[PDB]
Enzyme design. Structure first.
Site, PDB file in Angstrom:
ATOM      1  N   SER A  43      23.222   9.177  20.109  1.00 49.59           N
ATOM      2  CA  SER A  43      23.857   9.701  19.317  1.00 49.59           C
ATOM      3  C   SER A  43      24.499  11.130  19.353  1.00 49.59           C
ATOM      4  O   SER A  43      25.297  11.460  18.505  1.00 49.59           O
ATOM      5  CB  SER A  43      23.388   9.704  17.866  1.00 49.59           C
ATOM      6  OG  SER A  43      23.474   8.428  17.270  1.00 49.59           O
ATOM      7  N   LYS A 207      22.830  18.062  16.373  1.00 53.75           N
ATOM      8  CA  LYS A 207      23.212  16.501  16.349  1.00 53.75           C
ATOM      9  C   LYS A 207      22.103  15.781  17.022  1.00 53.75           C
ATOM     10  O   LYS A 207      21.712  16.187  18.354  1.00 53.75           O
ATOM     11  CB  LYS A 207      24.306  16.131  17.084  1.00 53.75           C
ATOM     12  CG  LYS A 207      24.890  15.017  17.004  1.00 53.75           C
ATOM     13  CD  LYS A 207      25.104  14.369  15.772  1.00 53.75           C
ATOM     14  CE  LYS A 207      25.046  12.880  15.361  1.00 53.75           C
ATOM     15  NZ  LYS A 207      23.477  12.323  15.184  1.00 53.75           N
TER      16      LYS A 207
HETATM   17  C1  LIG Z   1      22.474   7.645  17.591  1.00 53.85           C
HETATM   18  O1  LIG Z   1      21.516   7.973  18.395  1.00 53.85           O
HETATM   19  C2  LIG Z   1      22.143   6.391  16.601  1.00 53.85           C
HETATM   20  N1  LIG Z   1      20.858   5.593  17.245  1.00 53.85           N
HETATM   21  C3  LIG Z   1      20.995   4.204  17.117  1.00 53.85           C
HETATM   22  O2  LIG Z   1      21.770   3.785  16.491  1.00 53.85           O
HETATM   23  C4  LIG Z   1      19.919   3.684  17.610  1.00 53.85           C
HETATM   24  C5  LIG Z   1      18.288   3.856  16.806  1.00 53.85           C
HETATM   25  C6  LIG Z   1      17.252   4.286  17.305  1.00 53.85           C
HETATM   26  C7  LIG Z   1      16.154   4.450  16.247  1.00 53.85           C
HETATM   27  C8  LIG Z   1      16.071   3.970  15.186  1.00 53.85           C
HETATM   28  C9  LIG Z   1      17.396   3.605  14.620  1.00 53.85           C
HETATM   29  C10 LIG Z   1      18.444   3.187  15.524  1.00 53.85           C
HETATM   30  C11 LIG Z   1      21.812   7.058  15.106  1.00 53.85           C
HETATM   31  N2  LIG Z   1      21.209   8.593  15.493  1.00 53.85           N
HETATM   32  C12 LIG Z   1      19.710   8.701  15.387  1.00 53.85           C
HETATM   33  C13 LIG Z   1      19.350  10.131  15.491  1.00 53.85           C
HETATM   34  O3  LIG Z   1      20.183  10.957  14.793  1.00 53.85           O
HETATM   35  O4  LIG Z   1      18.244  10.342  15.690  1.00 53.85           O
HETATM   36  C14 LIG Z   1      19.433   7.806  14.279  1.00 53.85           C
HETATM   37  C15 LIG Z   1      17.999   7.417  14.208  1.00 53.85           C
HETATM   38  C16 LIG Z   1      19.818   8.599  12.758  1.00 53.85           C
HETATM   39  S1  LIG Z   1      20.431   6.295  14.389  1.00 53.85           S
END
Ligand SMILES: *C(=O)[C@@H](NC(=O)Cc1ccccc1)[C@@H]1N[C@@H](C(=O)O)C(C)(C)S1
Length: 261
Positions: A43, A207
């Site tokens: 992300s 972020k």
């Molecule tokens: C960005 O990295 C997104 N990640 C996912 O969609 C995969 C994921 C991994 C672990 C648990 C759930 C989903 C989103 N960004 C992260 C972050 O900012 O750490 C989230 C956990 C919010 S999902």
């Protein structure tokens, strides 16, 4: 026990691969650990998508306000704000906010959608002089973080350099730049990552990122109480596909490098 020795011990004890890159805007000096190695951005790539749209809003006074329709078929794995607006709409700006401050995946895709695909985000990066960054997929597949997989990766240094330019440099026009920053400071998901490794009185915009292989990331810009800003990228990934996330490791990294500022 140099900073490097501290980082190395941290990586070792973590049974993982730590990637760190800090730039002290005071003297442009930096601390680097595997900062030239590629890691799955997860992300944290969202920031590049957001900046991409801000860049074109510089040339389109209507862009950011444009509304986007949110249908139940847009929903993916993580859409904390997109859902609330299913059957309704969300402006490009609101999408940007949800994507960075809540890391809404649907939001990110909408942004990618609007931009013309991941390839466009990459182009925007190239236009920003970033020759390392590369976006290949959308949410959530961009979060596989498979070891040695080139897709959706960058290096801590490259991300560090770019984040700086975007938030404190020549990348975005003043108004856009400020908007980006506003969003980063407003992030609600990095409480246990980098932020947890710094003085509570210090200002931080960040972020986060989470993916398979216990990939734990965070990229931030820090405004110390009486010092120039610091730009810090902390990427962490593991060997077993289903390893847990280790935000605490990120915090440790930050504490370590942040010392003496
Ligand atoms: C960005 O990295 C997104 N990640 C996912 O969609 C995969 C994921 C991994 C672990 C648990 C759930 C989903 C989103 N960004 C992260 C972050 O900012 O750490 C989230 C956990 C919010 S999902």
């Amino acid at each position: 026990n140099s900073v490097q020795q501290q980082l190395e011990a941290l990586e070792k004890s973590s049974g993982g691969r730590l990637g760190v890159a800090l730039i002290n805007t005071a003297d442009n000096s930096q601390i680097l650990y595997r900062a030239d190695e590629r890691f799955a951005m997860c992300s944290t790539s969202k920031v590049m998508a957001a900046a991409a749209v801000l860049k074109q809003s510089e040339s389109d006074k209507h862009l950011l306000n444009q509304r986007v329709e949110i249908k139940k078929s847009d929903l993916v794995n993580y859409n904390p704000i997109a859902e609330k607006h299913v059957n309704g709409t969300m402006t490009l700006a609101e999408l940007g906010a949800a994507a960075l401050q809540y890391s809404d995946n649907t939001a990110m895709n909408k942004l990618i959608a609007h931009l013309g695909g991941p390839d466009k985000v990459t182009a925007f990066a190239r236009s920003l002089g970033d020759e390392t960054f590369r976006l290949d997929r959308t949410a959530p597949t961009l979060n596989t973080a498979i070891p040695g997989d080139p897709r959706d990766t960058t290096t801590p240094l490259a991300m560090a350099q770019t984040l700086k330019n975007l938030t404190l440099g020549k990348a975005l026009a003043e108004t856009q730049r400020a908007q980006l920053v506003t969003w980063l400071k407003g992030n609600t998901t990095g409480s246990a990552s980098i932020r947890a490794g710094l003085p509570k009185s210090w200002v931080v915009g960040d972020k986060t990122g989470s993916g398979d292989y216990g990939t734990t990331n965070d990229i931030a810009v820090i405004w110390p109480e009486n010092h120039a800003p610091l730009v810090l990228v902390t990427y962490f990934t593991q060997p077993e596909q289903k390893a847990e996330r280790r935000r605490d490791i990120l915090a440790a990294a930050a504490k370590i490098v942040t010392h003496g500022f």
